Design an enzyme around this catalytic site. Structure first.
Site, PDB file in Angstrom:
ATOM      1  N   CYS A   1       3.840   1.012   9.716  1.00 50.31           N
ATOM      2  CA  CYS A   1       3.687  -0.072   8.745  1.00 50.31           C
ATOM      3  C   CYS A   1       5.024  -0.570   8.209  1.00 50.31           C
ATOM      4  O   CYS A   1       5.935   0.213   7.933  1.00 50.31           O
ATOM      5  CB  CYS A   1       2.787   0.361   7.593  1.00 50.31           C
ATOM      6  SG  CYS A   1       1.033   0.362   8.043  1.00 50.31           S
TER       7      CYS A   1
ATOM      8  N   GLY B   1       2.835   5.551  10.598  1.00 48.46           N
ATOM      9  CA  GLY B   1       4.220   5.370  10.211  1.00 48.46           C
ATOM     10  C   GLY B   1       4.789   4.014  10.578  1.00 48.46           C
ATOM     11  O   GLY B   1       5.897   3.675  10.167  1.00 48.46           O
TER      12      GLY B   1
ATOM     13  N   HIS C   1       0.813  -1.216   0.000  1.00 48.86           N
ATOM     14  CA  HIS C   1       0.000   0.000   0.000  1.00 48.86           C
ATOM     15  C   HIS C   1       0.853   1.276   0.000  1.00 48.86           C
ATOM     16  O   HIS C   1       0.320   2.380  -0.093  1.00 48.86           O
ATOM     17  CB  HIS C   1      -1.008  -0.004   1.170  1.00 48.86           C
ATOM     18  CG  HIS C   1      -0.405   0.133   2.534  1.00 48.86           C
ATOM     19  ND1 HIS C   1       0.298   1.251   2.942  1.00 48.86           N
ATOM     20  CD2 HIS C   1      -0.450  -0.687   3.612  1.00 48.86           C
ATOM     21  CE1 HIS C   1       0.683   1.097   4.193  1.00 48.86           C
ATOM     22  NE2 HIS C   1       0.240  -0.073   4.626  1.00 48.86           N
TER      23      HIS C   1
END
Lengths: 299, 5, 299, 5
Positions: free
Chosen positions: C143, C141, C40
């Site tokens: 991820c 942040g 993503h």
């Protein structure tokens, strides 16, 4: 929710060594060409009182075996420094970090790298209680495990594990050899002193509760810091100093300290099946720094 | 009562 | 006491990299000449489903900037692997550890290295629930934060953070790109599935309580594993397996599993006002491995 | 909703 987290341990992991003297083996801190470790490694007794000045005089350097992994380090010399030994070895730790020595104050949080046989086994965050004790998780062999904080590239070493009191809590010395809370380097009967809830950390916790939708306990009243402080000293809680560090948390909740302080007096030793963020009691564990860092990522 | 680790 | 602890993170810290695509920046796992990160990173969505097949087709390699510290790694190629991207880069990670990929099972515990902007910020222990979710602590942040377990010198990578459900719990994919629990890497309405207490972990917990002098809750009765299992499945608890792994703990307490199972049935969703090691309910958090390791230091 | 981190 709110987690106790540790800072990444990699920078400290390669400074850990095994210090074996005779049949005693524990962990040492291996910085530069010096190894710091608890002095009782050279004692012959662990369950009876120790004469350390005599133990130092009987010390033989060739009875030392110091290792980093399976790499053994020849001992050069040894001197006694409080509850520690300074041990000089034949080589520098190439992976020695930028570090300093710092003594922790009550209420402050730091990291523990739990070590066994000269190897890091686990890492977790702890908080120094007014007791000058900590609730660590240590078993046999853990002595010499370092306590540290990572601050702008600098490792602040603040703890080397020494002792477990009968209550189950733990005491170490700082890297200057000074036992926290004036505790003693002996297997003598030592009852854990009285301790108080560090109110500033409690405030941080209640702020964390406000942020995550826990508002049932919020009080309608308010008290001034100095009038709370005169109550706190008689109710097993510390005094509140400067509330500026609570500016961010206040701004995001619209609730000031005075109102949190009042709610604490009504929540002290009184809940009623109630629970805040999974706590049945007021917790001392988290600082404002940790709370702000964990919810918003700011320092 | 305090045990050395 | 009983702490959630993390394994030392040093071996993983040097595998973490910042992955920036256009405006978006998260964390990647940097092994060999390949960087794994959540796909993503190339999509920009807030409320609607993402066409990842289309986002991949429009993807431009020169819009990537990948860095390890202040060292930039030139991007060679990129391919999609489940909920991840395989990004081939300019060079090999010299600090690539001995590692494997392993998909976690419900009930199993592992470590999370919370990362932000390509740098490790915190490390803590977690447990994979029957949900195939975890109760992590992640903010914006986070991820690409890796999950791992260290097994006999081998690093087992098992998690890359992807997602937070509305309930506050978290979902990641394994390193093959497979989303745990068949959840989708979309910002769509996804309700956290029903979950059961992992009974084997609860057994480990109650053993830990016996070991630490908590014996008030013990039942005198017993049920066979085979009959407890048929009760468990209809009362939100998992089935009990081999029970051999409880031999060490049984030996240390003189208490068998069957009697603990009986205690569980009387306890489940009907505790008094009493607590057990500071817990007001049965906890799912600790494995037999963790309990045995923390109390006795054997594996 | 689910939130992509």
């Amino acid at each position: 929710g709110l987690r106790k987290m540790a800072q990444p341990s990699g920078v400290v992991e390669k400074c850990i060594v095994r210090v074996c003297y005779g049949n005693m083996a524990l962990n040492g801190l291996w910085l530069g060409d010096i190894v710091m470790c608890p002095r009782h490694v050279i004692a012959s007794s662990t369950t009876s009182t120790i004469d350390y000045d005599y133990a130092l005089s009987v010390l033989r350097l060739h009875n030392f075996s110091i290792s980093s992994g399976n790499v053994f380090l020849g001992v050069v010399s040894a001197t006694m420094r409080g509850a520690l030994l300074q041990i000089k070895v034949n080589q520098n730790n190439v992976h020695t970090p930028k570090y300093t020595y710092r003594t922790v104050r009550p209420g402050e949080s730091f990291n523990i790298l739990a070590c066994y046989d000269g190897a890091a086994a686990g890492v977790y965050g702890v908080n120094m209680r007014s007791n000058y004790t900590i609730r660590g998780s240590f078993i046999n062999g853990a002595c010499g495990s370092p306590g540290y904080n990572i601050n702008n590239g600098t490792v602040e070493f603040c703890y080397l594990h020494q002792l477990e009191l009968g209550s189950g809590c733990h005491v170490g010395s700082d890297l200057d050899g000074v036992m926290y809370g004036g505790y003693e380097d002996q297997p003598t009967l030592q009852v854990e002193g009285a301790s108080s809830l560090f109110t500033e950390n409690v405030l941080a916790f209640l702020y964390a509760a406000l942020i995550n939708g826990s508002t049932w306990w919020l009080s309608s009243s308010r008290i001034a810091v100095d009038r709370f402080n005169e109550w706190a000293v008689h109710n097993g809680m510390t005094t509140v100093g400067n509330t500026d560090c609570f500016s961010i948390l206040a701004a995001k909740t619209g609730v000031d300290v005075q109102r949190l302080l009042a709610s604490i007096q009504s929540l002290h030793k009184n809940f009623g099946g109630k629970q805040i963020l999974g706590h049945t009691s007021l917790t001392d564990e988290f600082t404002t720094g940790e709370v702000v860092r964990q919810m918003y990522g700011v320092n | 009562x305090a045990v050395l680790x």
